[PDB]
């Protein structure tokens, strides 16, 4: 009976591929033959934030485009002021191996996680002064890779046990569980309206979930290695995925397939972070070869480089008003560009 | 100055930075080690002399030196993704059992292949390995009624004990192929005190070698 269901699955995938081929008429690079190029983009290191000692693994902006969080492997989680290069808090951690950090949209809580299989949630506005651990969520069997806040009551985490979870903070119970991947999931991004999200695993696949019911809705498979970072387009109808084969692609939700691929022969190294700009015209991608590249999101031609790091960039993120981009690498420093 | 108040904030920031520097100085004293092995390798033994899911942190102090041991065999996940966080360690402790007679594919060959994999990794090119050969007395009983040709097809020589052990040790040390690291060997046995001093000497030697080469004194 197993072979019958295998044949049925083959029929299903043939139907899917046929439909995807039928709905395709011309490529997006053929549509953009007339629109003018954006020119080269030059950016300067405006601020350098030198507080840590070990390598930096995560970073996330705040909502007001001024506050920042850094998570590094020396056991510290220190929030910065971007305009005045100050430190406003210094949170000592329990486990020194951290791979993710988060900042709440309202600025009241932050999160952290790592190889200790526990997502910790810290309270910043305590009446008694210092910052404290509010909960310690522990339901996974593998390590955590990416944690994102929905609101002050619920969080979404992605782990190494090939599963993702939605938590409720006041209770500590894993409200809904997302499953279906074959290998480790290593990235996650929330849509602007926070109703549905995407995740990127190490089986060269990215899936689209919905947080209300918990059902995988679309599967996209183009890559040839592990996918390491994911971010949406601003309008919530496309996203960009970075992998370990020197390639990053743009997938369309409505068309249900790939649109462009961004690779140039000079680069062999893999991606570690991907983000967009405010309007979606530019695409920023970190790399293992110690630099950051800017692509034309509609023309697919490099428009500049953000060099200036002694070691590989591991985190990357832009603000909510499009003013600055922050890059953090294993050299224990963070940079701000404008 | 034109910084109004706006002035206590900088004082708090400097206090925080002082705390970061003091914590770094305090945490610079300890020595970091990583523990690797395979099933039935016997790493639990070398752990149990130390004590007297996720990552476990066995902890001990010997002769005014602060030690940390990380056993990550419990992390049953993809290895390529969580080893890079474990670079900058002082040394890697490797456990090999002198019992290759049975299939898990031979266990000894699996251990040799895994040693080759970990020795030539991109991140661990310059991290010295301290090597432990367990079951010293069991292999002594075994070799009395078995040849080493079964483990290694190419072996030629005696079927005694010391020579057989030396052949295995040489085969393992054959894999380093780099000029800036060394493999230290100690043949442990059950009921054997001192396996902590075999680590103290190695760690001191590694630290002084790294200091000599770092200050360009070579």
């Amino acid at each position: 009976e197993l072979d019958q269901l295998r044949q049925e699955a083959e029929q299903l995938k043939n139907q899917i591929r046929d439909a995807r081929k039928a709905c395709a008429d011309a490529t997006l690079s053929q549509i953009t033959n007339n629109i003018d190029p954006v020119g080269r983009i030059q950016m300067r290191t405006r601020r350098t934030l030198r507080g840590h000692l070990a390598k930096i693994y995560a970073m996330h902006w705040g909502t007001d485009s001024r506050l920042l969080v850094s998570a590094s492997q020396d056991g510290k989680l220190i929030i910065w002021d971007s305009y005045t290069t100050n430190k406003v808090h210094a949170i000592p951690l329990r486990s020194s191996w951290v791979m993710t950090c988060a900042y709440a949209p309202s600025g009241n809580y932050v999160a952290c996680g790592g190889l200790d299989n526990i997502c910790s949630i810290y309270n910043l506005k305590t009446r008694e002064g210092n910052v404290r651990v509010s909960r310690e969520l522990a339901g996974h069997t593998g390590y955590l890779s990416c944690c994102r806040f929905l609101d002050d009551n619920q969080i979404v985490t992605s782990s190494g046990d090939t599963t993702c979870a939605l938590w409720d903070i006041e209770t500590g119970q894993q409200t809904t569980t997302f499953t279906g991947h074959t290998g480790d999931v290593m990235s996650l991004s929330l849509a602007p309206d926070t109703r549905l999200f995407v995740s990127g695993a190490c089986d060269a696949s990215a899936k689209l979930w919905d947080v209300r019911e918990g059902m995988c809705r679309q599967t996209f498979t183009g890559h040839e290695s592990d996918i390491n970072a994911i971010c949406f387009f601003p309008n919530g109808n496309a996203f960009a995925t970075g992998s370990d084969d020197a390639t990053c692609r743009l997938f369309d939700l409505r068309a249900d397939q790939e649109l462009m691929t961004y690779s140039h022969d000079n680069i062999i190294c893999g991606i570690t972070s991907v983000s967009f700009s405010k309007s979606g015209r530019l695409l920023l991608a970190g790399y293992d070869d110690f630099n950051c590249n800017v692509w034309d999101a509609l023309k697919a031609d490099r428009a500049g480089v953000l060099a200036g790091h002694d070691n590989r960039v591991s985190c990357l993120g832009v603000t909510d008003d499009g003013m600055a981009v922050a890059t953090g690498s294993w050299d224990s420093f963070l940079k701000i560009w404008n | 100055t034109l910084s109004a108040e706006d002035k206590a904030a900088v004082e708090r920031s400097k206090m925080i930075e002082k705390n970061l520097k003091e914590d770094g100085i305090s945490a610079a004293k300890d020595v970091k080690l990583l523990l690797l092995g395979a099933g039935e390798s016997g790493k639990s033994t070398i752990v149990k002399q130390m004590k007297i899911t996720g990552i476990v942190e066995t902890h001990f102090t010997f002769k005014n030196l602060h030690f940390r041991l990380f056993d990550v065999g419990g992390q049953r996940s993809e290895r390529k993704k969580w080893i890079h966080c474990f670079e900058d360690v002082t040394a890697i402790i490797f456990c090999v059992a002198l019992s290759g007679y049975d299939q898990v594919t031979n266990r000894m060959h699996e251990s040799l292949m895994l040693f080759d994999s970990i020795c030539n990794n991109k991140f661990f090119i310059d991290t010295s390995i301290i090597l432990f050969l367990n079951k010293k007395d069991l292999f002594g009983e075994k070799i009395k009624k078995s040849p080493l040709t079964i483990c290694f097809p190419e072996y030629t020589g005696p079927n005694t004990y010391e020579d057989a052990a030396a052949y295995i040790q040489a085969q393992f040390e054959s894999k380093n192929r780099s000029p800036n690291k060394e493999i230290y060997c100690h043949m442990t046995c059950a009921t054997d005190t001192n396996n902590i001093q075999v680590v103290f000497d190695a760690v001191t030697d590694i630290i002084i070698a790294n200091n000599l080469r770092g200050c360009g004194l070579y």
Epitope: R66, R127, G129 | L2, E5, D6, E11, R12
Partner: single-chain antibody
Framework: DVQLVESGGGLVQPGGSRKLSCSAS????????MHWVRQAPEKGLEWVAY????????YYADTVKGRFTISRDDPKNTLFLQMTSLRSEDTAMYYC??????????????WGQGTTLTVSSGGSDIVMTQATSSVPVTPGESVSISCRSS???????????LYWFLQRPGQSPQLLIY???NLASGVPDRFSGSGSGTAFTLTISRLEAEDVGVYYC?????????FGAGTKLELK
């Protein structure tokens, strides 16, 4: 709970000396700045001293420098004020406040209950005026109070340092607005503020009987800190 209790006050003949202590229990005392704000038998508030976290910076009022001294002993979480050559103008209630300072913080949030001290018979400051002395109000009505400064309070950083307090009868003052717009934690949403530069207002909507007292405005642009006379509110 957060608690600040003072003790060590009494009737002392002029020219004497005395030591005051402020005991703290319920917060991270070592990471706070502490002030001393005093109040005459029936007059308003007057700032006295200040000590920072780590005891780095100390400031004094010009009228009390040299006679007094301020110290803290953070292992035992107690604050001190040692005063010598007492004068007849120093008969006052003495308070103890906490003044955490960072981006987005809420300084002057908790005020102690104070101690009574009585003594027997024997030009660049930012003067701030509150022309109204009292306003009679009826429950449920909307009332607006004013505080006019001398120097414009808008620093180049975009900030504007003005605070508002409320002193209920027979109690200790609370904090309502910090930096001219930010409503404090625990205070009702009824209160709101506005202004531009030197003209300041505080708007109360649907006032009830629980918010009757005297309102003070404080400047924090530069030391020394200055208060106002305070506008009183009374029923009917």
């Amino acid at each position: 709970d957060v608690q600040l209790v003072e003790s060590g006050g009494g009737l002392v003949q002029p020219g004497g000396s005395r030591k005051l202590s402020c005991s703290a229990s319920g917060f991270a005392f070592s990471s706070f700045g502490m002030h001393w704000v005093r109040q005459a038998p029936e007059k308003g508030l007057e700032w006295v001293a200040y000590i920072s976290s780590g005891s780095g910076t100390i400031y004094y009022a010009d009228t009390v420098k040299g006679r007094f001294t301020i110290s803290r002993d953070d292992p035992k979480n107690t604050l001190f004020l040692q005063m010598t050559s007492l004068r007849s103008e120093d008969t006052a209630m003495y308070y103890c406040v906490r003044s955490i300072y960072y981006y987005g913080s809420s300084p002057f949030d908790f005020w102690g209950q104070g101690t009574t001290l009585t003594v027997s018979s024997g030009g660049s400051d930012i003067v701030m005026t509150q022309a109204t002395s009292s306003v009679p109000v009826t429950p449920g009505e909307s009332v607006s109070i004013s505080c006019r400064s001398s120097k414009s309070l808008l620093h180049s950083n975009g900030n504007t340092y003005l605070y508002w307090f409320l002193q209920r009868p027979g109690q200790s003052p609370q904090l309502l607005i910090y930096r001219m717009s930010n409503l404090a934690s625990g205070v009702p949403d009824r209160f709101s503020g506005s202004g531009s530069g030197t003209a300041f207002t505080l708007t109360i909507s649907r006032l009830e009987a629980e918010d009757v007292g005297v309102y003070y405005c404080m400047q924090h642009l530069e030391y020394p800190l200055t208060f106002g006379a305070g506008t009183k509110l009374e029923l009917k």
